[PDB]
């Protein structure tokens, strides 16, 4: 690509060619056109999956959930025109997004009825049916997660950043565990690095060592960050990464901070959190060898809203690790209350 | 940084904030006039007779600063002169390092007079000062000395011993199916066709420092004998530095001044894969010294398209590509090894 950068101290610009990585997090994904491979092809795939024993879909990210919402109406119509008693119901996402063991098949032949493009305006709405193919929702009772397909799409062409482009997708022929690399951007330049995708923005810096600076996650996905898109992948243990490997955290020395281990029991239930190294408001942390051992993460205020004042850690480093959600500040696993017992506090009940 | 960019293939434009790596393939501030002089003086009385440049950046710095440096040395009455020459590739390492002076020269802020004592910066002077008495990699970019909108780089004499290249001028990035490893002299591109592989490289210098692993993609599970650009020539220790069927090119034409690695045949040539071809060795040029063009080459188990180097003086071939019938004793050979 060709592009220009701006400095606003002295109003001028610097232009050239190269590779540009943009901050695409916290941008609305509702303003694109989605093209799962073909209406008849997708209908045949869903039909064959239902006949095999696969009940529904578990979503890798929120982009896939929005794609299914955009598709479901035409998909149900075209399924109806072929005389199949099956309807697709799309729900909402909650974190963390657990992964499933099944995969969505690639049919030999498409269904021999219906139109040949997405977006055909005007269709007779289909009627409800006894059989439901539930895309992820609050419906883990008619069929559990051990019968749901996961990570069965590949992005072939996209225009993210331009609000009226098409996204082209196809159903893959293989089983996989890594995240889709078409939407990943990693870049370092000098003393700053970024690991990013459509829902992650992870920053690093060069102090005495390379370390994690701050992160911003609007989803908790459980695929694996590809090693082709990671900086400094060797010589690092999986038990030192701040963001767990099972939460699509990069396997990098850039994903580390001195004095902390992996945060398997952080507040991963929240819809959106932001990782900082700074004390929660009205709180102080002291480094003492008499403190307790690390456990589940604790919220700074109690269930009634009272702010705890004193916490301790054994061998951690200032500033302390914290999480920022809608509820408020949480603390890392290594930081425990000083005086008030932990039975009075709200603690995380989710493990990675 | 905040900016805008366009993709001409699709005619789509966008703006925002992020990290941008530009293709670049500069009024330096060598420490201080009164302190670099003291460092050079102490080094000369320490037994160091010269400097071996790490890159062309340092050579241009020395060539710009030499006049004022000589003026400072003469005004302080120190019997020493600084002579800077050109750059010959590859740029080999030196075992010494410049000292950090405790105090600056008392005098300083007209030309100078040539003396009998020479502190020879990189040049064609290996007899007066052999490589085993020359300093190397003795400078570091300051904390904010480099940036997108600087056009003036601040350097200072380093206090430690190191082997890696300066990380302040390195930019590497990957976006989708295109990746780049780059600095002020290298521009190394890779792609994903079936696997990740080297696509093309453009080099305007051959350094011998080490590419740091903090600025490298996919550093694990890679053998040092598979890298197309040798690790000894500041090639990244990455799977992005590999191409199927080829090993490390230790005997390529690294004597050039500006190289360009690409995978396609030299003009008017044809390569076939045969199990009855000669073994690998030094790289051979496509045109003989008399101007005649060889036209039929072989490789044993290489992969099409073939590896080729594009210098201003011809089109060389990878170490695995040998002449089929025409004897290679009359062809041109590379005289350097990484």
């Amino acid at each position: 690509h060709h592009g220009c950068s701006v400095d606003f101290s002295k109003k001028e610009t610097r232009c050239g060619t190269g590779v540009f990585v943009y901050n695409d997090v916290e941008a609305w994904r509702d303003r694109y056109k989605y093209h799962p491979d073909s209406p008849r092809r997708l209908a045949a795939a869903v039909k064959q999956a239902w006949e095999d024993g696969i009940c529904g879909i578990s979503s890798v990210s929120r982009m896939e959930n929005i794609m299914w919402r955009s598709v479901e109406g035409e998909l149900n119509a075209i399924l109806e025109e072929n005389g199949v008693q099956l309807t697709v119901v799309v729900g909402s996402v909650k974190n963390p997004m657990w992964r499933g063991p099944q995969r969505l098949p690639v049919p030999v032949n498409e269904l021999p009825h219906g139109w040949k493009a997405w977006g055909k305006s005007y269709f007779v709405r289909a009627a409800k049916t006894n059989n439901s193919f539930v895309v992820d929702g609050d419906t883990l009772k008619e069929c559990p997660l051990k019968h749901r397909a996961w990570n069965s799409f590949l992005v072939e062409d996209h225009g993210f950043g331009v609000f009226h482009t098409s996204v082209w997708l196809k159903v893959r022929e293989d089983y996989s565990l890594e995240c889709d690399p078409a939407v990943i951007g990693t870049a370092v330049k000098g003393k700053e690095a970024v690991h990013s995708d459509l829902g992650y923005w992870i920053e690093s810096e060069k102090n005495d060592t390379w370390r994690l600076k701050r992160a911003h996650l609007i989803e908790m996905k459980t695929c694996e960050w590809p090693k082709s898109h990671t900086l400094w992948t060797d010589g690092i243990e999986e038990s030192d990464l701040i963001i767990p490997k099972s939460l699509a955290g990069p396997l990098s020395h850039h994903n580390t901070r001195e004095g902390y281990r992996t945060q398997m029991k952080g507040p991963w239930h929240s819809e959106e959190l932001e990782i900082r190294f700074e004390e929660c408001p009205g709180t102080k942390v002291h480094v003492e060898e008499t403190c307790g051992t690390r456990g589940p993460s604790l919220r700074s205020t109690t269930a009634s809203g009272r702010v705890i004042e004193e916490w301790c850690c054994r061998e951690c480093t200032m500033p302390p690790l914290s999480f920022r959600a809608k509820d408020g500040c949480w603390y890392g696993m290594e930081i425990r209350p000083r005086k008030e017992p932990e039975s009075n506090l709200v603690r995380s009940m989710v493990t990675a | 940084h905040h900016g805008c960019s366009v993709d001409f293939s699709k005619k789509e434009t966008r703006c925002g904030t992020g990290v941008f790596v530009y293709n670049d393939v500069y009024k330096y501030h060598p420490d201080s006039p009164r302190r670099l002089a003291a460092a050079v003086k102490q080094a000369w009385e320490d037994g160091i007779c010269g400097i071996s440049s790490v890159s062309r950046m340092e050579n241009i710095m020395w060539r710009s600063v030499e006049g004022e440096l000589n003026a400072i040395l003469e005004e302080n009455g120190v019997q020493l002169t600084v002579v800077v020459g050109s750059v010959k590739n590859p740029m080999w390492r030196g075992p010494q390092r410049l000292p950090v002076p405790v105090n600056e020269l008392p005098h300083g802020w007209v030309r100078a007079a040539k003396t009998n004592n020479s502190f020879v910066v990189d040049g064609d002077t290996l007899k007066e000062c052999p490589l085993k008495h020359r300093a190397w990699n003795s400078f570091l970019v300051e904390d904010h000395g480099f940036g997108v909108f600087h056009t003036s780089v601040w350097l200072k004499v380093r206090e430690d011993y190191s082997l890696e290249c300066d990380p302040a001028v390195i930019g590497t990035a990957v976006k989708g199916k295109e990746a780049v490893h780059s600095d002020l002299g290298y521009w190394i591109e890779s792609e994903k066709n079936d696997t990740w592989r080297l696509k093309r490289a453009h080099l305007i210098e051959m350094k011998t420092c080490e590419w740091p692993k903090s600025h490298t993609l996919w550093t694990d599970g890679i053998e040092e004998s598979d890298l197309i650009i040798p690790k000894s020539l500041a090639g990244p220790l990455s799977h992005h530095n590999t191409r199927e069927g080829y090993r490390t090119q230790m005997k390529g034409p690294w004597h050039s001044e500006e190289l360009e690695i690409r995978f396609e045949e030299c003009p008017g040539t044809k390569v076939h894969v045969e199990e009855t071809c000669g073994t690998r060795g030094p790289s051979l040029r496509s045109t003989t010294a008399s101007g005649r063009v060889i036209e039929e080459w072989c490789c044993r188990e290489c992969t099409m398209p073939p590896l080729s180097f594009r210098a201003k003086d011809g089109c060389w071939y990878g170490m695995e590509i040998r002449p089929r019938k025409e004897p290679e004793s009359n062809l041109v050979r590379s005289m350097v090894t990484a």
Partner: antibody
Amino acid sequence: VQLVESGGGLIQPGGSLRLSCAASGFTISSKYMSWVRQAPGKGLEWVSIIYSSGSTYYADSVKGRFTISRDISKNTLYLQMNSLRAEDTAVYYCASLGSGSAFGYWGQGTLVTVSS
Amino acid sequence: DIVMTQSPSSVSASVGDRVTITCRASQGISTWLAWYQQKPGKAPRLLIYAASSLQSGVPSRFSGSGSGTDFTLTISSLQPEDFATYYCQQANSFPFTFGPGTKVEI
């Protein structure tokens, strides 16, 4: 500058051990720190190195078993030794790299015995 | 790997005599060589680096020379404090390898 090596004793084969090196007069994050061992009656052997930037390299004999690391706050160098064998018994030194790519400052040594 | 060989295995000399020890490499490690001194019960000490440069604080009665594959360490006036074991090690590429060793007797 000073280098003092502490945590080496007796261990049974197949066991693990952790060595330490305390530095005085300089910061560990500014030098190339290395481990060298000398078998009783034999010569010297280079084990592993850590760069000032944090890069690590190993000899093929101990490639997957030993691990070198640092602690900036404590200003100490470590070596984690796992799945020890008979040929791992020696005196382990703590050395640093400087001009010529050679070792200038050595420790006082620490002996490790692997026997049942 | 680069294998380094040393000769002689042992040598004996009296006070004030000239001593010569030779190191031999198996590849082109040119001018990237160092020489050490090992006393029994002590850590090694660096004497020469870059095949000719004298480490600071070492007496000048030691001298080095060589390039390429062959190298030589010379003591001019032997002293009673200079009876120890001496090694050469290459500094050209990883892994770094030392020499078998040479003992100076009497």
